[PDB]
Design an enzyme around this catalytic site. Structure first.
Site, PDB file in Angstrom:
ATOM      1  N   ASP B 490       0.794  -1.236   0.000  1.00 32.30           N
ATOM      2  CA  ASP B 490       0.000   0.000   0.000  1.00 32.30           C
ATOM      3  C   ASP B 490       0.837   1.303   0.000  1.00 32.30           C
ATOM      4  O   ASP B 490       0.313   2.377  -0.317  1.00 32.30           O
ATOM      5  CB  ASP B 490      -0.911   0.023   1.238  1.00 32.30           C
ATOM      6  CG  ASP B 490      -2.115  -0.862   1.101  1.00 32.30           C
ATOM      7  OD1 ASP B 490      -2.559  -1.148  -0.041  1.00 32.30           O
ATOM      8  OD2 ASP B 490      -2.647  -1.247   2.143  1.00 32.30           O
TER       9      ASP B 490
HETATM   10  O1  BGC Z   1      -5.311   2.268   4.514  1.00 32.22           O
HETATM   11  C1  BGC Z   1      -4.542   1.393   5.376  1.00 32.22           C
HETATM   12  C2  BGC Z   1      -3.055   1.378   4.989  1.00 32.22           C
HETATM   13  O2  BGC Z   1      -2.609   2.507   5.715  1.00 32.22           O
HETATM   14  C3  BGC Z   1      -1.196   2.781   5.453  1.00 32.22           C
HETATM   15  O3  BGC Z   1      -0.974   4.012   6.126  1.00 32.22           O
HETATM   16  C4  BGC Z   1      -0.332   1.678   6.083  1.00 32.22           C
HETATM   17  O4  BGC Z   1       1.076   1.915   5.837  1.00 32.22           O
HETATM   18  C5  BGC Z   1      -0.777   0.374   5.450  1.00 32.22           C
HETATM   19  O5  BGC Z   1      -0.190  -0.727   6.130  1.00 32.22           O
HETATM   20  C6  BGC Z   1      -2.291   0.193   5.553  1.00 32.22           C
HETATM   21  O6  BGC Z   1      -2.616  -1.030   4.913  1.00 32.22           O
HETATM   22  O1  IFM Z   2       1.019  -2.715   2.305  1.00 26.21           O
HETATM   23  C1  IFM Z   2       1.023  -4.114   2.671  1.00 26.21           C
HETATM   24  C2  IFM Z   2      -0.316  -4.492   3.363  1.00 26.21           C
HETATM   25  C3  IFM Z   2      -0.719  -3.340   4.335  1.00 26.21           C
HETATM   26  N1  IFM Z   2      -1.958  -3.754   5.037  1.00 26.21           N
HETATM   27  C4  IFM Z   2      -3.109  -4.123   4.171  1.00 26.21           C
HETATM   28  C5  IFM Z   2      -2.758  -5.132   3.064  1.00 26.21           C
HETATM   29  O2  IFM Z   2      -3.786  -5.019   2.063  1.00 26.21           O
HETATM   30  C6  IFM Z   2      -1.459  -4.769   2.354  1.00 26.21           C
HETATM   31  O3  IFM Z   2      -1.159  -5.846   1.443  1.00 26.21           O
END
Ligand code: BGC
Ligand code: IFM
Ligand code: BGC
Ligand code: IFM
Lengths: 822, 822
Positions: B490
């Protein structure tokens, strides 16, 4: 019962116990940086925008309320206490909190140590300064350790409280035990990335130690009242990595009997240019230069005192424009000090951040900030000017506007909904009030974009025509303005019909079609359409003015043909074309808003106050009888006991609260003003008193909330909690009551070409003098007032009689002595 | 070192102290009603959706953590304590918490009174049941008064935490002291308007008194640990009117020596049909029929016990599909109990609500719930089946998808971003894993809408072709798939270039244009494209399948030609076509995700584990040297130390946390499986152990979080908090480690046409027996394991040698006995 008292010569409210019915706050700052400070040192600070640059964390609905603020733990031979009482709640020998204009002082004393803290936001600074004075009041030497404590917020308050899955790994600090003037901790979360700002928390001495990790300072399983570090008697010198950053320094002091020591703490907001963000080539260490300059500007007590004295001067100067001297000390403290001070706060805050508004969803409201102008234009007209430009820039080309804008970016949003049809006319209210006050006709030529589009600029006046035309071209089958999402009443949603729970009536999608009309907008239109017509005439726009007057006449006629119920004005026509606010329905028979506002627009006003046939009198008598309580006037009666799907949010409140039968104080000044219009000064002043802080101080245990400021909402006669307030401080009640008492009761109001002097306050204020500075001249207005119903004033000016009640503006620098007989 | 211990026979984790490093919770419920329950009774409960129907209030980041939940205050002789320890923190002679499968037990004893509470959500019930047993353990008769306590949430958790200006005026209760089975309190906020549901809090006895108002029960200035009512020893019988509604009952108890009494408390979620909402014509009194029934379903201890037994039987039955018996009891407890139990929870919660995820912004992640299916399809295939339809319904006609959906409504939203280009292939992953498990080919014909649109239905299979065609038609200049907002990671936002603070990278507007490509998506496409082709082949689509194996071939070849850096796979190409994850860069040289995923996809596999020329072996060796730690494998090395504008969110974390050098445990099982694929069982098992709860229990004081469940993130080697986890419970780590351990290490994995038995676990588990129910038949698989590097299995089946490692599916009802030599 009471929990304190006004101190008029000091311009303070003095709170004499920590045991108030509710946390009682003050606002620090008047410019770009703000603090919510409770009488127990609770609350937080932010720069410009409570949602997007919140420096420090505060928890709403905490148990107990308000454990979270600027604390100073005192450890004296192992006994730990806080002079703010909370969070430790150790018994104090003496406690006092004084809320002044832009500063408060909190003093607590226990076992021969007295700790006084002066809090404030200095002029021209983005910082909150505390001057702590520690005194040995015993007969033996004392040694204590003082641990300062603030808890940082990660800037975006919404992300702070919801996005731990990310934000518990991002907290970062630097610690500077040996700075140029003392010790400092830097909170610099996300400065590594997109933020060009950080916070400093410093003391004007080399601290014995420090703490930057919340969990280490407070300890596992502990509340703030049980914090481990002050109990251990020494700092743990913690360096945060993620989790909860805080600011804390320890200072040990030794004091002989009678001796004191001052310490000066600063919580600062600092920015750097992008090219100047970092001390080092590797971009790892923040550039501290503006923090060291800030700490150097408050390194000494003298420097603090000079800034406090400058804040005092600045306020004496703001309060020099309008003042009154009479036989009513309660009236006078309201008019001279408290209502004007609140007006500055609402001008800055709108409805964003208080102890009820959370500094999240609410930015600057279009209607809210326009009406705040009405009680602000005399204080600093150059800031009111800028504010008009800012509001109008969030209006759309079709004359409709964004309901509110983000304080940080000045850009409108729909977070609390859109398509509120009373909105556009408020812009004209604001501008008319401003021009009357200042005579700055030039503002009408200011080029102003629509929705902030560069290149979309038109003269401000042209925006006003868009507002006016919006209403002209959106009238329903009776000639009354289409309501849209809601009018002034956010909860009168006639285009809604929601059966889906938990979706906001404010943001939820509305039904196209139907025929829903508002009697309130109609009245608003007559009132401000008239001002629009005046500005068009003065702009040299003869046909536009004629055309505008014809529309106002149409809508006024329509209020009388279709907006009259028999003994009061109708509220609206619903989606189906059925009347709202009629005696023919069992609940919601009479609504307050069109009563005050139609009468203010002069609709249905007859021969005088004894003309029992004039609709205005009949309307105001039905308001007295059906809506009157000892606490003010309720919005409608009876309140709705079941959900009415065609009416929206309104009936979702239990009866007696908020828009369902609560006293919504903001609309009480409309009835006050109306009453002066028809010549019933005695009853107008009665209404003024029922809701005004100074007169309600003696029931502090019923009102519960601050006894020195207006609240939005006082529970109504149909509430179990009748007379208990909610939503203090941030309310248009302040600006509207200031308009009511300063301009209609006391009677001194600017017009375009002279200063109208038209007292209508009744017999309880039989003599008084108003000092009003208007257009560079000072008017000394000496009033002798019989209070006889419908008796209206005659004037003499500088020894000569004049006709009517308008005194043409004398030249700047002159002193005009007006002698008024009522 | 340890704060409890596993109890395998009981399928419990036994916590032997209140003083854990962090609150350690359980989830109650596996259907539509759920509870988060800490070992101090902290947490809350919700129906279907943590944001939209939250029954009871809980505060994240409270001071201290987790002061709030289901409290029972005991007043014995004026001494007040809670058997949960918190909030009163009284010394207990004995404390214990047992977290079981869908229930927990918390026991506290003080001064001769032992109070045990069993919490669980019963099967078929939208309720949390508490059965309290108070025992007199002294030798003399004892008396005490017990005060129950739960604090209601006003349903919409976001409104509850942010909208006090409205919601402090809406809280509504009813009190029924004399109900059919005992006393009950009803929380009915907004039942007046759009809600057809209310909550009940009741007890199976006529309570001495009650409280519904928080401020009266707790007292002004007090925390929950100082609540006034229990200290006074008598309820105030408060009836809430707005503010903060609670449920509390007092019960006087008397006990002879050694005697106990059970009390049964119920927190329930009830709905009425719109036409039966009210008991009264005037619509003021809620219809209590369903609540009376519910309370009568738990009126006695016997009923509670029978429902706990049915819950035990339901778990035994869920857990009967896959079991292992080996020489490693940590391995056993993981596979047999904890990893499956966690998989059930992630199936139900996605990433929405834990003690870190706040149950506001995160609904049901597209990517997350598809992958959760991988660890869940063997537990309850029918529920997995329905989840596939729900998920696929939030896909768009062009094959991309809503990144998540709202649990209550099943509708996609963009609240945490859109256009994540890995999302669509996860739908293939989940359907393939489901068909391999169940052999339910017919799900491919299920009609499934696009974006819940009536009349847009096509077969599920067509959805998978839109997924597959999305990647083929969205490749960049190297033939690798365009990344969009991000891929699996993400925080890799290559189309971002954000310089504006405080807007989420997840949600901020992306730049059109550029050539940004993902090596990860490429490996994903190779793996799941192949699966798609097989599904097409089974449906007799030889045209489609042939074309599909061609595209898979082109992508595989693009990874080898343009996605290989020398000793590992490249990560990406940025907006301008610059390589990401290359040794030519100073930071972020190697990134884990393409290494495991490419090798899992068979890319760069060579002659065997000792083929030093093979890309797969070089990539895995580099992972080992550069990414490996005692706590698992960090996401990339080295972590970025300055903000990289062109990579988005990733370089915004301090080094070693979350996506910037954290151990992101979800991607470790990919490396685990890759090592098995390549023939290095020993290394694969080692990686498994490093992140696995039963193996990390011995370092509870370093992990900090629950020692019985996987966490999302363990701080990596560049973090000062190396080894400390955040974000427990809700992670795809659970499904992916279960896949790794059950299917690739132990080696038992369903394929389309038979059960593959391919142990690859190395020498530390030299014999074991797996019992696998598959397609109605039971497989007893007895493994004797040399652990020799690269050695793979030969099988004999019911006395006769078979060729290869696939045992064709026996008919339903058979027991097949398979003998495995490695
Ligand atoms: O929307 C949720 C996403 O937020 C980001 O700020 C985090 O780094 C990710 O781990 C998470 O999956
Ligand atoms: O960025 C890696 C992961 C962060 N938490 C939600 C998951 O969808 C994602 O793969
Ligand atoms: O969005 C702001 C509005 O919210 C409504 O629910 C309240 O009843 C109004 O008083 C308030 O102005
Ligand atoms: O509905 C009445 C008022 C509620 N608070 C926001 C104001 O704009 C509105 O007029």
């Amino acid at each position: 019962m009471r929990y304190g008292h006004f101190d008029d010569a000091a311009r303070e409210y003095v709170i004499t116990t920590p045991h108030t019915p509710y946390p009682w706050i003050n606002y620090l700052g008047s410019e770009q940086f703000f603090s919510l400070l409770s009488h127990q040192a609770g609350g937080y600070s932010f720069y410009r925008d409570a949602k997007m640059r919140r420096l420090t964390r505060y928890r709403y609905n905490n148990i107990p309320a308000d454990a979270g603020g600027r604390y100073l733990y005192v450890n004296d031979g192992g006994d730990v206490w806080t002079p703010s009482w909370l969070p430790v709640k150790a018994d104090l020998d003496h406690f006092e909190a004084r809320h002044g204009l832009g500063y408060s002082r909190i003093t607590g004393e226990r076992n021969g140590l007295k700790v006084e803290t002066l809090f404030f936001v200095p002029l021209g600074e983005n910082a909150e300064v505390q001057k702590v004075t520690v005194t040995n009041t015993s007969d033996a030497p004392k040694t204590a350790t003082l641990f300062s404590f603030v808890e940082f917020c990660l800037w975006n308050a919404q992300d702070d409280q919801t996005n731990y899955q990310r934000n518990l790994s991002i907290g970062e600090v630097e610690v500077e035990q040996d700075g140029p003037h003392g010790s400092a901790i830097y909170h610099k979360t996300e400065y590594r990335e997109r933020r060009d700002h950080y916070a400093v928390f410093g003391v004007n001495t080399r601290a014995d130690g420090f703490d930057t990790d919340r969990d280490t300072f407070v300890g596992a399983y502990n509340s703030l009242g049980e914090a481990s570090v002050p109990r251990a008697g020494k700092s743990a010198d913690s360096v945060a990595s993620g989790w909860y950053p805080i600011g804390s320094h320890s200072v040990a002091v030794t004091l002989q009997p009678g001796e004191s020591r001052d310490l000066v703490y600063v919580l600062g907001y600092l920015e750097n240019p992008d090219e100047e963000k970092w001390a080092d080539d590797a971009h790892q260490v923040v550039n501290k230069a503006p923090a060291h300059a800030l700490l150097g500007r408050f390194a000494t007590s003298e420097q603090v005192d000079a800034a406090l004295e400058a804040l005092n001067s600045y306020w004496t100067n703001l309060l020099s424009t309008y003042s009154v001297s009479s036989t009513d000390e309660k009236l006078d403290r309201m008019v001279n000090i408290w209502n004007q001070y609140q007006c500055m706060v609402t001008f800055n805050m709108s409805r964003s951040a208080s102890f009820f508004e959370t500094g999240i969803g609410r930015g600057m409201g279009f209607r809210d900030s326009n009406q705040d102008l009405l009680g602000f234009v005399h204080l600093i007209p150059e800031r009111a000017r800028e504010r008009i430009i800012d509001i109008a820039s969030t209006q759309f080309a079709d004359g409709s506007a964004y309901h509110q804008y983000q304080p940080l970016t000045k850009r409108g949003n729909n977070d609390i909904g859109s398509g509120f049809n009373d909105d556009p006319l408020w812009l004209i209210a604001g501008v008319a009030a401003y021009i009357k006050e200042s005579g700055d006709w030039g503002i009408l030529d200011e080029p102003v974009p629509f929705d902030n589009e560069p290149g979309s600029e038109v003269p401000l006046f042209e925006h006003l025509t868009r507002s006016f035309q919006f209403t002209v071209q959106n009238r329903g089958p009776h000639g009354l303005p289409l309501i849209g999402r809601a009018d002034w009443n956010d909860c009168l949603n006639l285009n809604c019909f929601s059966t889906t729970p938990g979706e906001s009536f404010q943001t939820t999608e509305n039904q196209a079609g139907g025929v829903a009309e508002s009697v309130f907008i109609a009245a608003q239109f007559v009132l401000y359409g008239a001002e629009y017509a005046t500005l068009a005439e003065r702009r040299g726009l003869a046909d536009v003015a004629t055309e505008a007057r014809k529309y106002v006449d149409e809508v006024r006629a329509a209020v009388l043909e279709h907006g009259w119920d028999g003994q009061w004005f109708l509220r609206a026509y619903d989606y189906y074309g059925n009347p709202v606010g009629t005696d023919a329905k069992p609940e919601g028979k009479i609504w307050i808003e069109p009563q005050g506002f139609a009468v203010m627009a002069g609709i249905g006003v007859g021969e005088g106050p004894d003309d029992a046939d004039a609709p205005a009198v009949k309307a105001l008598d039905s308001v007295n009888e059906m809506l009157g309580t000892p606490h003010g006037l309720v919005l409608q009666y009876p309140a709705y006991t079941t959900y009415q799907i065609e009416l929206g949010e309104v009936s979702t409140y239990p009866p007696g609260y908020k828009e369902n039968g609560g006293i919504f104080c903001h609309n009480n000044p409309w009835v006050i003003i109306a009453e002066t219009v028809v010549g019933r000064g005695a009853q107008a002043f009665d209404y003024y008193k029922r809701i005004t802080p100074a007169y309600r101080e003696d029931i502090s245990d019923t009102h519960k909330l601050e006894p020195y400021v207006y609240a939005q909402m006082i529970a109504g006669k149909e509430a179990v909690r009748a007379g208990e307030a909610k939503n203090s401080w941030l309310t248009g009640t302040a600006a509207w009551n200031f308009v009511a008492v300063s301009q209609y009761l006391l009677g001194v109001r600017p017009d375009y070409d002279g200063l109208v002097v038209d007292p209508q306050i009744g017999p309880d204020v039989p003599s008084y003098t108003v000092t009003r500075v208007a257009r560079g001249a000072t008017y000394e207005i000496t009033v002798t007032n019989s209070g006889a119903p419908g008796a209206r004033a005659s004037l003499t000016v500088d020894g000569a009689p004049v006709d009517g009640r308008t005194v043409p503006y004398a030249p700047a620098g002159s002193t005009v002595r007006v002698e008024v007989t009522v």
